[PDB]
Amino acid sequence: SAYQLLLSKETLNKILQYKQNLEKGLATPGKFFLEELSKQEKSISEMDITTFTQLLIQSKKPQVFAESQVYHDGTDWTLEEESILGDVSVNMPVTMYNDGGHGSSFKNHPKPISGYLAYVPGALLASGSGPTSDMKEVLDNGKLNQDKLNALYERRLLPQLIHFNELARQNEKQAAITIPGIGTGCFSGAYYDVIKPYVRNALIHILEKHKDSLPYIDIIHYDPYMGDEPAEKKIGHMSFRVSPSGVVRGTTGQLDYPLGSNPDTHILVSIVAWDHFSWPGNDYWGGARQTDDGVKAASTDTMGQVTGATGVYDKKWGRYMPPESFTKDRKGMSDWGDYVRENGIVFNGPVLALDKSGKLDTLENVASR
Amino acid sequence: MQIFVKTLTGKTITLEVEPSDTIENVKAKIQDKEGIPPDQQRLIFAGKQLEDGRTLSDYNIQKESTLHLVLRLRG
Ligand SMILES: *NC[C@H](*)CC(=O)OC
């Protein structure tokens, strides 16, 4: 119950495609998915769609260099699996111990604040080998296609926006959502110098299109660090702020209430730029408080939500550390990825899908319709 | 003289040092050949972390010793 996986209707169709073809012998699993399947007892056709989806998600590894050390060839994952995994997001309640500043710029919260993270994989436009699934999807002979990029981010973000609209309503609050430059860093690959306006346009497109379904979403605080102009934009009832921290001095951090929100009026949600192949937190499973993914995981109790262990926050380095009973006498082999290995923890949790009517429901129910 | 620096992943670097060189200077020589900021460097010789202010003779590091560069690899 510590975290919840979500995916779009289109993604569910992809999963149904894949399961059907495996059942017929007409598709072949990748090596890592096959390992997860072979650790349990059900045949593909015996297991339901949720179990199948969970076992594919379970083939993720704690730390993956998604932009350079993945091969897309079935020796790790196939492109069909990659297309599905990229659409899966995961949310979880978190305690936020600092404002999420990178490097040494983080500011510790005097009292840690309560909120949520939603890990969403960015468009992967980088590869150390063949083209990625996202490259095949959104590039037209090399040209970035804004409409296709829009559809990809809509697919991946909307289930989380629907989720937290509902959660805000249930708590009699509104939602304040902070967003980073998702997909603009190493993920952009050769597109690093052009990607920034495309991502902001996609976020605006999603919010404009689905404004009528998000009445409890109030503030969206978008911070791509550099490369965009300061702005407020009214999108229906919503306030969409473009506040690049490298351009606007004093910008509120990603793990902090943006201007006009506070704990009594708003739930605080931060989108995390995730990736197809890793557990939420990627780099910090290897002890590196780097990238939006690693920084936000290190600056929250993400690792405690995923592993069930009670960590301890280190104010000097802004890091949620493994239990002291684990790290004592383990110097050099004490980071969170080592804790997962020695304990055989797996990434596997409840999964819901967004149906055609904008409701989140079980994969079986949405497939029936 | 020769010393060898070697990462956990097996990358080998050869340095020109003296026993008078300080570990700070040695981390600067590694940045010179590889661009690794001294901040990100842990140098290990015989199970001991090497303090920045001490010297290569303090740790009895002689010619053709192998130091271990513990890095936390970047994406
Ligand atoms: N962590 C991946 C970043 C790639 C890079 O440094 O491009 C030069």
Residue numbers in the entry:
A (entry chain A): 41 to 409
B (entry chain C): 1 to 75
From the reporting publication:
While crystals obtained from the co-crystallization trials turned out to be those of apo-MavL, we observed electron density for ADPR in one of the MavL-UbVME subunits from ADPR-soaks and managed to place ADPR within the electron density. Inspection of the structure revealed the adenine base of ADPR coordinating between H142 and Y265 of MavL through π-π stacking.
Further analyses reveal DUF4804 as a class of MavL-like macrodomain enzymes whose representative members show unique selectivity for mono-ADP-ribosylated arginine residue in synthetic substrates. Crystal structures of several proteins in this class provide insights into arginine specificity and a shared mode of ADP-ribose interaction distinct from previously characterized macrodomains.
